[PDB]
Design a protein around this ligand. Sequence first.
Ligand SMILES: *[C@@H]1O[C@H](CO)[C@@H](O[C@@H]2O[C@H](CO)[C@@H](O)[C@H](O)[C@H]2NC(C)=O)[C@H](O)[C@H]1NC(C)=O
Ligand SMILES: *[C@@H]1O[C@H](CO)[C@@H](O[C@@H]2O[C@H](CO)[C@@H](O)[C@H](O)[C@H]2NC(C)=O)[C@H](O)[C@H]1NC(C)=O
Ligand SMILES: *[C@@H]1O[C@H](CO)[C@@H](O)[C@H](O)[C@H]1NC(C)=O
Ligand SMILES: *[C@@H]1O[C@H](CO)[C@@H](O)[C@H](O)[C@H]1NC(C)=O
Lengths: 499, 534
Amino acid sequence: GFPEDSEPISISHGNYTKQYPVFVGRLDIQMIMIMNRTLYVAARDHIYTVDIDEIYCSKKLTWKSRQADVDTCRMKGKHKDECHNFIKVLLKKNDDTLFVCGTNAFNPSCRNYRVDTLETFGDEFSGMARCPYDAKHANIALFADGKLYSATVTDFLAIDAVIYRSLGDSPTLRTVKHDSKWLKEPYFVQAVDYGDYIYFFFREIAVEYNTMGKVVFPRVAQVCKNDMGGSQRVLEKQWTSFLKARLNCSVPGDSHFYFNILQAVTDVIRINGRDVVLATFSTPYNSIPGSAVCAYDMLDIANVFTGRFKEQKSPDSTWTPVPDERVPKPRPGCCAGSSSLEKYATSNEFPDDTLNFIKTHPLMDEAVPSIINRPWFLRTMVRYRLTKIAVDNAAGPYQNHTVVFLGSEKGIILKFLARIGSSGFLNGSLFLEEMNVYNPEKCSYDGVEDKRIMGMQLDRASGSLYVAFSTCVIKVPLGRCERKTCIASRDPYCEQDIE
Amino acid sequence: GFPEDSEPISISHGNYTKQYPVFVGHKHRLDIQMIMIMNRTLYVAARDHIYTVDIDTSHTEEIYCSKKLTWKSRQADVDTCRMKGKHKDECHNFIKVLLKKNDDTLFVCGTNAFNPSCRNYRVDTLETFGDEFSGMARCPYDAKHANIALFADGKLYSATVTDFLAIDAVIYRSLGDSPTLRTVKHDSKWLKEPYFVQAVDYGDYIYFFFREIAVEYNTMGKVVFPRVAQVCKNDMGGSQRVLEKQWTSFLKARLNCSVPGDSHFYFNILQAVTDVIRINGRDVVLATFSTPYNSIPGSAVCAYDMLDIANVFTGRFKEQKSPDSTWTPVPDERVPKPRPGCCAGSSSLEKYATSNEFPDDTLNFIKTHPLMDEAVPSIINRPWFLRTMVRYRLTKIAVDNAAGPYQNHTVVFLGSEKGIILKFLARGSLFLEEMNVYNPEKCSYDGVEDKRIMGMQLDRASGSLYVAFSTCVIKVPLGRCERHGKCKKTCIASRDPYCGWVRESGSCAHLSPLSRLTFEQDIERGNTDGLGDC
Ligand SMILES: *[C@@H]1O[C@H](CO)[C@@H](O[C@@H]2O[C@H](CO)[C@@H](O)[C@H](O)[C@H]2NC(C)=O)[C@H](O)[C@H]1NC(C)=O
Ligand SMILES: *[C@@H]1O[C@H](CO)[C@@H](O[C@@H]2O[C@H](CO)[C@@H](O)[C@H](O)[C@H]2NC(C)=O)[C@H](O)[C@H]1NC(C)=O
Ligand SMILES: *[C@@H]1O[C@H](CO)[C@@H](O)[C@H](O)[C@H]1NC(C)=O
Ligand SMILES: *[C@@H]1O[C@H](CO)[C@@H](O)[C@H](O)[C@H]1NC(C)=O
């Protein structure tokens, strides 16, 4: 008896949400992020800023592609609408430096800007492998210890999907070119900084099924922060700690129902004493639509990489565990400078047997279990899929509720509470709100009505959740209280029974 | 994207269907197991009784019982049943097998409080004659279990469990003055926790349809596959060295019901299967499938040509060369002669008068390889009907292939877990009707509303579909032609083969065999050009 979708304990409509403030500058919004007290809007040609304290553009950055780049782009058969500069990487390098990469008419490049003035600093440089050529593509970029971690394609034809590290005075490292054991048509979702590792969350064609046709799996991948590459013999200029595993997001039973299409992942956040990520999953395109929110314990992620490795004995075999006696000493995947690998100053010093093993065996046998071994949330027979995810784990007057905000491709935002009262149970989440937030009258212009939520930033200070569409940014209040007997909603933002 | 649910041309709610005649057992929770039409008699098999209902009599609000068969369990079986730890509600004689043996004899088996047994009964008198015999492997112990029974050339073909614990699932043949045959005991290559759905007589074979755990797909968990399997009607079993007193023709294959894409989406859980129906020059079965009970609920109807079914069993056999290697096709060079699964007396096998004369090579191979490599394609390689945005699954199925005044339309009736019947025209398919036929006031017995459809029997002569829930049977008119009354537009637009505009009465009506009147309808196009709404 597969869990039946509960209904929201509050629905809101374009009727109500209509009057929420909107930012408009077609804009072609690529992403948004809050830093300190300013919302950043990354779009075509520009990055606008909004003082979070109609919505007005308080300052804007400007970076238009040179005409020769546009012509070059056009001359490769690209349509005029995509041969512009679309900002696709936006990070703080430090307190003074914004790091900005644009598609730049299918000619990726990166630049440093100044936080305070938005003026240019230093000169531009190749964005190859740091930024996509195509604004339509999903990308990852993140700084850790000054090193830039990125995931995108290296090439104009988008065939060379890469997980890459460059900058920060360390060697540049990449995944093995065209090695489908490493990467098979990935789609990049998220990267997090944790402990000794960067963790990448993406989806790819599952080789575990290369016998049985086209199946997409959700993956988490590990890299050692201190990776220096291989020796001159094996894996030179390439990762030596790359390991990946299937994520497990399922409703269990005598047969398990897997949600395999990874949509979004949160940053690492703290819940019930644990460091976790929350991830939104969907059923594939060709299926009965369904979405799930599973949570993952950083420890469960870590533990998976200590388990057995996967192999395929012959082209006619199922994928099986490697018996431990065939695993070389030192064990692949551990970071030089740690327990029993103290004798290796760097990965450059790792032996051949270790480096050859990890080159050929990047996939772990086990799948990462989720916390509670089931989703915390489900949405099944609706004509939309859950995409973006923003959390507030300090919700309410006593700052102790975990409210999760979920977006969709149709401009719908769901809101739910993960934990009810002081007990700490997580097996009974409450569906607080289903709401349509997309505003046709302020967002549908320049021949474009697209309702895909491009991103969303939660801002406790200003009590609002900023929602990005392609052409507009909507300022939604975290709760709907004004709508009497308003204790009925069990909304921690609004005495109040939530029992 | 993924094809979304179309809406029915006409809708019929519980407040309207409530007038349909209902049988509840007057002339006590019924626990109806199955219904069966024979000639002009509707047989209702239930707990301790088979009720009969005359199909002719134009009934009122209530349908009444004409005569009655009584078979309550012996007290000793009831008490042994409770001694073995079964609940009180479980320890009764539920009738689960009912077949016409001949013109005079009804063959009946009942769970008998977890001690199955069979008797012969006379049609007219409904009283037993002859000794009782064992229902072991002919009828289940447990009422909630699904089972198959069928006669052909006098042989009884049954599919069920032999044991109280329900571990030894079997496909079985006995009686008919022929040998007794079973599927090999505890061999998971033959059957693995099967769920028996339907058996069919066709050509020189009996075809069984069921779901079981997939041995081909034992990686990521237990997965259930739907199957069709064949036996030779003339199977005599093997010889002393191989398959003695066992099938020598048993072969099975995956059934493909899927919506194609980059990744195909399967409906794997076989729900129901029709008898063989003739449709535009083709002999076919129609089958309902759902997504597993633990997934987002979806249902599908797929059709299978008996020729494609037969064709799969001539293709290549599957094998697993090594414990954790994948399942591959056996190359023909390794297939012995005579070919495993060929009936003695058939082309190039006529040399063999009997399966007991098959060589060991043949028998050993079929014992080892009962699974065909290929899956049975459905007709046009996609479902004729899908339900994907509803909280019910589609189960039972009834087809009328001679619908309309010219008896040339194909109308399909679908039942469900929630008392809803759907009606579509096969041709893609045209969603005519959705009706809730469950009657709470006549079918709820205590608190309980068990809205599951136990069986449907279509009766063309009386223009009725009989719908069984576990506590009542509802007499459902094939069409709701009366609804439209004097409105020609809606009457035509309904595009229902059972309904027409009758010029002389100036109204919509059910289109008679007594077609002594003009009967306008447009099924093919539905063209309403020139009519105004009412
Ligand atoms: C995904 O997670 C679930 C829950 O941890 C796993 O389900 C277990 O699977 C085993 C073997 O099938 C069962 O015997 C257990 O009873 C299941 N656990 C629960 C809590 O139901 C499932 O196997 C995982 N999938 C993968 C591929 O690792
Ligand atoms: C079930 O049927 C579908 C549809 O016939 C099969 O999908 C086809 O498979 C062929 C051969 O592998 C492909 O080249 C075609 O592209 C597929 N057709 C379509 C319309 O996509 C599918 O293989 C069958 N499934 C099984 C298990 O046999
Ligand atoms: C939050 O704090 C309040 C105030 O004491 C307490 O009553 C409530 O149970 C707490 N809720 C959670 C989820 O910790
Ligand atoms: C049924 O028969 C009539 C008369 O022969 C014909 O006009 C109609 O097209 C037929 N419909 C079908 C589906 O065969």
